[PDB]
Design a protein. Sequence first.
Length: 212
Amino acid sequence: APLHLGKCNIAGWILGNPECESLSTASSWSYIVETSSSDNGTCYPGDFIDYEELREQLSSVSSFERFEIFPKTSSWPNHDSNKGVTAACPHAGAKSFYKNLIWLVKKGNSYPKLSKSYINDKGKEVLVLWGIHHPSTSADQQSLYQNADAYVFVGSSRYSKKFKPEIAIRPKVRDQEGRMNYYWTLVEPGDKITFEATGNLVVPRYAFAMER
């Protein structure tokens, strides 16, 4: 039986856009029936990277389990995990954000270097998704992350990328002049994924153990 999506297409659903819960409630499916929308379902403007490849990866799944890869309550003692909400991503009138990610911001006037790792203990491939935020101005950068010159690194045995955000005023999209790009990778069982940042990282909160 196919997986029926609700208000949004695959991007919005997999990121956990508050509006985009599926109509089907299955943990396996033969294919995915999407929606009448032509946008992918991301609420904060930006580009979902390797999107077509993810759609194929999520096409015929035999098991699918959402789990909290980095628990909100215990993963980030040195950063703020409550303030990352936006008018771009509303939930019943209120500023919100994707359920599966956390928009980490500075706590006080401090954003220490974060370093967070996960070793896949699910016994199957784990789909991990994250975001890189590109602020509109220097003040935006400093207001969110304190550090003017930040970087992000994501690494596994299969993946390696260093991100340098570009600070620039883009045209307003849902009132947003910054941009977020969205990334993902599959982590082999027993392999380690490491996140490192001095700012601008939209961290995983929920990931997905799966089998095709």
